[PDB]
């Protein structure tokens, strides 16, 4: 006798009409059969759905600021953008614009910013993980023609929240498979399209559920977003982390949640910050702080096991020397500056998705028949940039003091030492040219100068992309002077002043500005 | 009737207004009907669910160390991580953070670690290998069924071969097991057959896998513990201590008639098998034991069968594979590099021939492009240093150079063995013989440096098996020498170098 | 049973005779069944497909060009084309629906233009994103023998609107 729960749920028109009809059918019928399992299944799925249960949101931004500044560190542009969004929701009360998209390398706090937006606004949090989504009927649901039929995860996570307005986190909108039975990008389109959110059609419920109340935010590693989804997203683009930012994330946020997780009280374990810097530099190559959670959690766990099987030491202190006793040998190492001015070697700046690295460039001009060999897993765009740079050297051959027959008389080899690591892009062109000049005059390159820039034939230095990880890489490696092109000078207003105060950044416009600074002797 | 049974276990109160609810419904129905069989079945599948009766978990770690070492030989880092998990499990009574995962190739004992951990922690072992009430009758869910069969509140649970669970077909999604793994959704796990929320906290979870090909909602909660391949002394110690007695007991061989020597086992490992684990060794040992039984029934004259390194061609067939040895009998113009792979290590001889010609450069032996780039880099190092090595510098145009590696139809690629090929080029150009007792590894650059390599341990075990006495490693791999067994350190004269001059000083028998 | 919704729908002859043969077949079946669930699903789809419902279209041209000028700026060739359609439409009863292909750079105003044509001609609006459509089952659907069988996604949007003359925005044909 479930007649009072339909009126108790206060459902809309089609929901009440199909449930009243369903109830009567079940009532006429016989219990304990599988068809009564399907019918009774349909009613107790149609009663868990939040048809009218709304959570009150909060409309203050000082408290939202002082919630978002905790649980995270240094995402001030991202948190600024979120406070713009909640600043809009205090006046519009329902956003009809795009959806907040959190893009960044793996390890940055995207899901945790989902939780902190959800705590900051006042709504209930929910996360729909993707990656295993191949079916469109995994988001929209199946119909009830099959014996085992249960709805899609959208209205089921809506059922485990039980609130009309949650905060969905569409996690990993990039990662989904290619062998797809339906088109889930159309369903994920119509959950995000405000003309199609008033009328959402679940295949199990077969009714008209309203999704014009839910706040959606999504996460992303890259932009392999499917085509109908990309114009409904507002990209915030979380960038990578420095070393001192990871030291303050581990200092203020990762250690108190691993001392508490292993129940280490204050008189047991003291991890020195140079050990944290040694895990950053020496053990991990992530852009985020997930691997810092792995080696910090493993480090605290080894401190626990030592405090049980020792019973003599009561205060374990871990400086930068004892990690080799605990976390083993050093796994990786970063490239750093050279000590003396070598002739052919030029340090360049390379940009990867796990952060920025240095990029050593050796050349060798031996007396031969004039054949150039390029080694080091170089892409074709790099090889075109090298022979462009060699064309610059051949055009400026007489004023650089170079014997102009070196195309015919001297074999030239260009090697980049990490031979197994593939690498591509024009952004090392003015490096290569310098190395070639340095091998054709015997003028050594001063080892404290890194450089980046795309070279053209008339000598000018075109702009490059991503100065942030490259200046962090030159900052980490012990480089003192960085030669950037001029039109990347704008990016110098987005760099932390530890780097600017540490480095001596010289913008260049042409190749004579590079050859004047970067070589020891005057050309 | 059944009331003393439902109060005899003292089930929680919610499940006893449910159980007493179908009991007072059972008072108002016919006994012999099949609906009453569904009712009595639903009573029976709740009085077997372990609502209580925990197993006392053990807190000391020395007896846990030896009761881990009583069934597995050399998984020392894994056993360390398990004792650390039992240390925080000793302090924190309920660890609900991430979940232990054992990633490794098939053959190592990652499944039987569920047994060693199972009687090491003291709890009961339930293994799960992954790869609603109605009139027709229904069994409960698999996750709950293991629990009921075990009948204990704290049973270790294993998720075996999640790499083979998630296929390319419609099967189990990530939902029904990450709702088991997550901490906040385990206080109320309502099983669909019972519709009663049953707790899953204080239940240890171990999941084993052969790769990191794990679904993305699950890889967030799984600590990737790697299990490297066993070395040959470790495989000998696993065969002799743990694997011969289980074949003797599953073949019923009493101890007086069969003797499988140590040279027999090392002959199987070196000559008859190539894998990372010890499974193919057990196919060879089981074949050896059943041939011993057949040779006792078919001949009642002899009774004791002695099996050693010589008579493994009478048994087991003939030698299927072989490994590389040091060519110590002469010192010639070739070098001995080191090669690393998943099965283990291998010696990798490298040959050059430099005849008079036009300067043709031929590279041979199924070489990858990164290796050919390392030959060109090494030859550039020789051309840049032609005068002080004593080479007439016109060899780029007056002598053809051939670089061959002997095992054809074997694909070879990698940045390593650059200084080996530079040593072979300096050797065949100067006429200076490379001393045969020296193996080499490293990566050459144009300035003459030696860059680090990977897999130093298997290269050092390959060089120790091959008969090499002197190994030239890079300087920045001295660190990896902190994890070599000291018999291998004591037998190998390891020289960490950082340039090509330190290489050519040692590796060439005459001074340059 | 359900003939009140069949004669309430005013179906054409083949669709009416087929759905009343299916409903007449359904009554001689025992309920609580699998194939009876299949037949109730098929009747449930054919009772919500539009067979007669038609929206009244706009005859005025000055009000139309006023609308397409209020929500866009200077898409003169397309707005001319829509005035051509609304100029022909005032001379006859029904025309074949025009099949257009707007080709241009991103951000040039092709989707909101479809919203403008929908609001101006009097038609109703629904869009089907063709980006990621990889198989014919999103257009023709599957046979009802199959378990997860639905009538494509054209008929689902025809049923989602509920009219015989909508404006399909077949968006991103080249994707």
């Amino acid at each position: 006798a479930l007649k009072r729960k339909i009126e108790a749920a206060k459902m809309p028109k089609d929901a009440r009409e199909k449930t009243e009809a369903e109830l009567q059918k079940l009532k006429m019928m016989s219990p304990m059969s599988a068809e009564a399992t399907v019918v009774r299944g349909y009613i107790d799925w149609m009663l868990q759905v939040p048809w009218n249960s709304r959570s009150k949101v909060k409309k203050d931004l000082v408290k939202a600021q002082e919630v978002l500044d905790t649980d995270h560190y240094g995402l001030e542009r991202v948190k600024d953008r979120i406070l713009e969004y909640l600043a809009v929701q205090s006046r519009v009360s329902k956003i009809k614009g795009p959806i907040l998209c959190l893009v960044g390398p793996p390890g940055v706090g995207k899901t945790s910013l989902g939780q902190s937006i959800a705590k900051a606004t006042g709504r209930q949090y929910v996360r729909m993980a993707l990656g295993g989504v191949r079916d469109e009927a995994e988001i929209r649901g199946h119909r009830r023609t099959y014996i085992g039929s249960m709805p899609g995860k959208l209205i089921q996570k809506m059922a485990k929240v039980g609130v009309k307005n949650p905060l969905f986190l569409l996690d990993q909108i990039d990662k989904m498979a290619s062998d797809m039975r339906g088109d889930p990008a159309s369903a994920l389109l119509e959950v995000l399209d405000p003309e199609q959110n008033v009328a959402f059609n679940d295949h199990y419920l077969e009714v008209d559920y309203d999704l014009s109340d839910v706040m959606f935010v999504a996460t992303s590693n890259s932009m392999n977003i499917p085509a109908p989804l990309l114009d409904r997203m507002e990209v915030i683009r979380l960038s990578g982390y420095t070393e001192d930012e990871k030291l303050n994330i581990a200092k203020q946020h990762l250690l108190p949640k691993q001392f508490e997780r292993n129940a280490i009280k204050k008189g047991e374990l003291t991890i020195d910050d140079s050990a944290i810097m040694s895990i950053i530099r020496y053990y991990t190559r992530e852009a985020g702080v997930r691997s810092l959670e792995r080696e910090i959690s493993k480090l605290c766990r080894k401190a626990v096991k030592n405090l049980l099987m020792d019973k003599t030491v009561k205060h374990i202190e871990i400086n930068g020397d004892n990690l080799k006793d605990f976390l083993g040998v050093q796994k990786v190492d970063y490239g750093r500056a050279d000590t003396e001015n070598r002739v052919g070697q030029v340090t360049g700046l390379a940009w990867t998705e796990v952060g920025g690295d240095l990029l050593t460039i050796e050349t060798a001009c031996v007396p031969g028949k004039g054949k150039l060999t390029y080694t080091g897993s170089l892409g074709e765009v790099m090889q075109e940039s090298i022979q462009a740079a060699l064309t610059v050297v051949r055009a400026r051959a007489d004023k650089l003091g170079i014997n102009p027959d070196f195309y015919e008389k001297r074999d030239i080899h260009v090697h980049v030492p990490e031979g197994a690591t593939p690498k591509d892009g024009p952004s090392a062109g003015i490096a290569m040219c310098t190395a070639l000049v340095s091998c054709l005059t015997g003028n050594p390159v001063r080892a404290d100068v890194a450089m980046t820039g795309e070279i053209t034939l008339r000598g000018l230095v075109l702009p490059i992309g991503g100065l942030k990880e490259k200046l962090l890489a030159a900052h980490r490696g012990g480089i003192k002077v960085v030669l950037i092109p001029d039109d990347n000078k704008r990016d110098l207003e987005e760099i932390p002043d530890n780097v600017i105060a540490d480095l001596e950044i010289h913008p260049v416009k042409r190749i004579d500005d590079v050859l004047a600074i970067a070589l020891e002797h005057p050309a | 009737a059944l009331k003393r049974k439902i109060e005899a276990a003292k089930m929680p109160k919610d499940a006893r207004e449910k159980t007493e609810a179908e009991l007072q419904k059972l008072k108002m129905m016919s006994p012999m009907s099949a609906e009453a069989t569904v009712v009595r079945g639903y009573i029976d599948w709740m009085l077997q669910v372990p609502w209580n009766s925990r197993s006392k978990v053990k807190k000391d770690l020395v007896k846990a160390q030896e009761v881990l070492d009583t069934d597995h030989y050399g998984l020392e880092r894994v056993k360390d991580r398990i004792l650390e998990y039992l240390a925080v499990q000793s302090r924190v009574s309920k660890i609900k953070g991430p979940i232990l995962c054992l990633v490794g190739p098939p053959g190592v004992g990652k499944t039987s670690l569920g047994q060693s951990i199972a009687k090491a922690t003291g709890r009961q072992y339930v293994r799960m290998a992954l790869g609603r009430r109605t009139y027709i009758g229904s069994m409960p869910g698999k996750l709950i069924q293991k629990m009921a069969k075990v009948g204990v509140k704290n049973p270790l649970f294993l998720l075996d071969q999640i790499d083979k669970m998630a296929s390319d077909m419609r099967g189990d999604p990530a939902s029904a097991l990450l709702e088991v793994l997550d901490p906040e959704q385990n206080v109320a796990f309502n099983d669909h057959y019972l519709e009663v929320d049953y707790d899953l906290s204080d239940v240890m979870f171990v999941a084993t896998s052969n790769s990191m090909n794990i679904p993305a909602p699950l890889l967030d909660r799984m600590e990737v513990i790697r299990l490297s391949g066993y070395t040959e002394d470790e495989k000998l110690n696993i065969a002799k201590q743990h694997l011969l007695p289980k074949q003797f007991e599953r073949n019923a061989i009493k101890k007086g008639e069969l003797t499988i020597d140590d040279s027999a086992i090392m002959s199987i490992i070196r000559y008859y098998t190539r894998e990372a684990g010890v499974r193919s060794l057990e196919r060879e040992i089981s074949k050896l034991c059943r041939k011993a039984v057949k040779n006792l029934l078919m001949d009642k004259t002899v009774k004791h069968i002695e099996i050693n390194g010589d008579n493994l061609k009478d048994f087991l067939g003939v030698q299927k594979v072989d490994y590389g040895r040091a060519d110590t009998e002469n010192r010639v113009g070739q070098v001995t590099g080191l090669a690393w792979t998943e099965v283990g290590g291998d010696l990798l001889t490298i040959e050059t021939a430099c005849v008079p010609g036009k300067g043709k450069l031929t590279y041979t032996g199924s070489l990858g492009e990164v290796m050919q780039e390392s030959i060109q880099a090494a030859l550039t190092v020789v051309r840049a240093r032609a005068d002080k090595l004593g080479i007439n510098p016109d060899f780029y145009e007056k002598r053809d150079i051939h670089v061959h590696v002997p095992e054809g139809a074997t694909p070879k690629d990698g940045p390593s063995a650059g200084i080996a090929m530079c040593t072979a080029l300096v050797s065949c150009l100067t006429g200076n013989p490379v001393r045969a007792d020296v193996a080499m590894t490293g990566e050459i650059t144009l300035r003459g440096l030696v860059l680090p390599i990977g897999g130093l341990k298997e290269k050092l075990l390959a060089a120790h098996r091959g008969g090499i006495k002197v190994v030239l490693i890079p300087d920045d791999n001295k660190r990896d020498l902190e994890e070599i067994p000291d018999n291998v350190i004591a037998d190998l004269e390891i020289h960490p170098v950082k340039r090509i001059d330190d290489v050519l000083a040692i590796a060439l028998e005459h001074p340059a | 049973a359900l003939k009140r919704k069949i004669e309430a729908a005013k179906m054409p002859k083949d669709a009416r005779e087929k759905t009343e043969a299916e409903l007449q077949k359904l009554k001689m079946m025992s309920p609580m069944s699998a194939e009876a669930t299949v037949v109730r699903g098929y009747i449930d789809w054919m009772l919500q497909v539009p067979w007669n419902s038609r929206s009244k279209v706009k005859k005025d041209l000055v009000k139309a060009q006023e609308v397409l000028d209020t929500d866009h700026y200077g898409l003169e060739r397309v707005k001319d084309r829509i005035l051509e359609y609304l100029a022909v439409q005032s001379r006859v009863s029904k025309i074949k629906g025009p099949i257009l292909c707007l080709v241009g750079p991103p951000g040039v105003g092709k989707t909101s233009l479809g919203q403008s044509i929908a609001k101006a001609t009097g038609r109703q609006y629904v869009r089907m994103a063709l980006g990621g459509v990889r198989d014919e089952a999103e257009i023709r659907g599957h046979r009802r023998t199959y378990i997860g069988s639905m009538p494509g996604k054209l008929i689902q949007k025809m049923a989602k609107v509920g009219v015989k003359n909508p404006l399909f925005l077949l968006d991103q044909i080249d994707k």
Binding site: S33, Y146 | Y135, I136 | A34, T145, Y146, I147
Partner: peptide
């Protein structure tokens, strides 16, 4: 109750 094979 009777089983029935679906495609």
């Amino acid at each position: 109750a009777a089983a029935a094979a679906a495609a």
